[PDB]
Amino acid sequence: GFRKMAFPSGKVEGCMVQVTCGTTTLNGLWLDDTVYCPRHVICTAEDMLNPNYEDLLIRKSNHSFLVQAGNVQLRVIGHSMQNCLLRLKVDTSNPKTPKYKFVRIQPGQTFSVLACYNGSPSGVYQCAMRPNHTIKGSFLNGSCGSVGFNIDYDCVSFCYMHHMELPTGVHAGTDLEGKFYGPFVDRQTAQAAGTDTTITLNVLAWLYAAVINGDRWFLNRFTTTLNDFNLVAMKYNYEPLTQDHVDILGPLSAQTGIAVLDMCAALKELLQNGMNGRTILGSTILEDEFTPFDVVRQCS
Amino acid sequence: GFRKMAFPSGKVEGCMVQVTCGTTTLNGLWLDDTVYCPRHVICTAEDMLNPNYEDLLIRKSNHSFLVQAGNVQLRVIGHSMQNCLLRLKVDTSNPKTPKYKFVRIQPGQTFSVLACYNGSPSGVYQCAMRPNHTIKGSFLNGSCGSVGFNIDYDCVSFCYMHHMELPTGVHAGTDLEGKFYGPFVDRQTAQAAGTDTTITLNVLAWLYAAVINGDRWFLNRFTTTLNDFNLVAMKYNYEPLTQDHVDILGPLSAQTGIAVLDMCAALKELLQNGMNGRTILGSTILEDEFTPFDVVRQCS
Incomplete structure (x- = not known):
């Protein structure tokens, strides 16, 4: 939404x-x-x-x-x-x-972070794990040990613990088994975030959210090949879309009656030509921190 | 920020x-x-x-x-x-x-909303009271009687209760004394939201936050009178900035070493020339939903 x-x-x-x-x-x-x-x-x-x-x-x-x-x-x-x-x-x-589980999320998935300082909850925010295995958070003077989580009914799935700020100000950490997301290590080295991409799966989900909410001007008459889409998208620094991703978007595609590759064709046109001053869901940009599941959870 | x-x-x-x-x-x-x-x-x-x-x-x-x-x-x-x-x-x-208080907030101030459905908490989000007394984003649908609040130490300040959806998606509600923010009533009329402006003071606060985070590209050697700043900013649908607002920006001005009128000169240039495909704190637009207090609390 x-x-x-x-x-x-x-x-x-x-x-x-x-x-x-x-x-x-x-x-x-x-x-x-x-x-x-x-x-x-x-x-x-x-x-x-x-x-x-x-x-x-x-x-x-x-x-x-x-x-x-x-x-x-x-x-x-x-x-x-x-x-x-x-x-x-x-x-x-x-x-x-x-009630709780420990889970390891995948790159591009979202979770809530409760930022704490000295054991004391300070703020809560929603974020995504980036393709490059880092989070664009707001972790300040003593926030290490803060966790990311999803809640499904009354079960808390813990997925992230905060360990380090990286040279760019982005954040690196582990799952609740103590395994780092990313190639990162808990020592002072020269480690830096890799270059980041846009989470295509998530942009597509948000475009489905827009259509579900009646904002659909960006739809067109045409389709594309998966490969032809990736050829365009990767030029714009979008994560290659996989058949697995196509399948993940299945429920939203069935809800709206819009095939994923018809939606890819709309995104392709958005990237090549821009919004032209317009908004989608009141945004001037293509949003990438809502998953297919987030979209289904909220509006749908 | x-x-x-x-x-x-x-x-x-x-x-x-x-x-x-x-x-x-x-x-x-x-x-x-x-x-x-x-x-x-x-x-x-x-x-x-x-x-x-x-x-x-x-x-x-x-x-x-x-x-x-x-x-x-x-x-x-x-x-x-x-x-x-x-x-x-x-x-x-x-x-x-x-521990708790009821407070009536002022337009341009921020608060958190715990969105609920049938007395079941669904989500929390941070927002601002708009100058026209509405709350933006369409994300309080189904959640009548959901409350906004701020928290200081262990004391909750309740400031907002959700009542109505306006014809434009945005929400209207009351304080915890039952008094509406803005000219709305709890019946089904054609009442609409008044003209809205950008929260100038918040935009300046956020610009300060960007300098504190090392984002500096939009600064300039120019300064401005408050009057001349206002003659311009008012063309772009920004709230008139008063000396009271300049004064609130004191601590942030002293922190960064940038004079408030110098930072206004930056905003004037940013309004007159646009952002030229650059971002400030990751945003392609000037953010007005962080108060100066929020910036102190969260950015620096």
Whole structure:
């Protein structure tokens, strides 16, 4: 539609904690008797250069970690490493633990992020994982350990934890198994975001959203080949569209009676000629941070 | 200032309930022993074309209102009208009630809306009260009695309740005292939104945010009088900027080292020459939905 929306953040707010090792404070996620946070919490200045994490961690005791849930200190009674995450066992299982899963999303998919500072929910926003495996977020002075999530009924699917700002100001992080999205690493290296593309699947979904809402002036009489579309789109720095993507857009295509390649033909014409001062869904640009599922969830 | 950020919505989620009258169902807000919802819950299609609310309400008892917090019915044990709100008294206080205030906001100010359907939170989004007293984006359809709010520390400031859709997609609603923002009424007339302007003060605030984020290309060596800035900006449908507005921009001016009148000179040039295919904070248009306070809170 028109407004981009985040999921209501309440269920995730009740899981946010502050984790401190000496001089470093970040956010952790408290689910049952476990707190999850970036492993780099155990790290200092010089450590970030080339950290032997599994060495630095051998040093630490349970009493090293200060876990604060609002006004209560949670006793840490275990710690371990899973990839780029520290897992802290605490003596209290979170009475607000929602129904939840850990998922790994795909590039181009959207999720809500609750930005927190020192364990304290600060703001909520909706974003996409970019094709280049980074997020164009707003993570400021101490937001590491903030999570991305989707909510389907009363089940929270956690998908993202924030680890690092990249040289461009874009954000890099892991799933909830501690595996980075992207080639990125939790140390100070020369790593930079790759060049980014537009999420074609998502633009197409948003064009379906527009048509569903009666904004359809951009439709035309013609069709295109998949390959002929990709030939045009890639010149505009759009992600090649796959047959898998064509299939993903199936329900919206059946809802509107507009074949995906008929819609590609409309997009092709939009890219070559522009909007000509017009708007789609009150936008002067082609929007790419709404998935097919987002579109179905909201209007459709 | 890349991302519009909503306040975390958990304190408000715990306050949302469904209120049913006949076959009319909408959202209510349960604070302690009271449920606030729009008065037009008591109206039908007949009634909405020309309601006398006093005459409609007197025909009602406590039992005619069905209020549900989730699956659990709350019994109504008192009812009164406050301007365009119904106030229902219930036989339980809400243990989830946060600290809270009712505030009437001013046009150009921002707030978060928790969009709900049948007392079930659906999404949260950040928005501005437009100078013409409407709220933009078409994303409050079905969500009558959804509330806007701001949060400061642990205190929710409720500022907005959704009532109506105008013929132009945008929404109208009241404060939590039942008073409309703008010249609208809760009946089915041809009332329309007045002329709207761009929130000049917010655009300047956002331009400051871009300089703080290292986006600097639109600055110039020129300055301007407030008068001459206004002679131009008013041609482009921008709110007149007053000295009060210049003064609000002080902190941001002192942070960046750019004089407010110098930054106005930048905006004048940007209005007169357009953006020339460049972006500012990722946008191809000048954003007016971040207040100076938002920019301090979120950008720097």
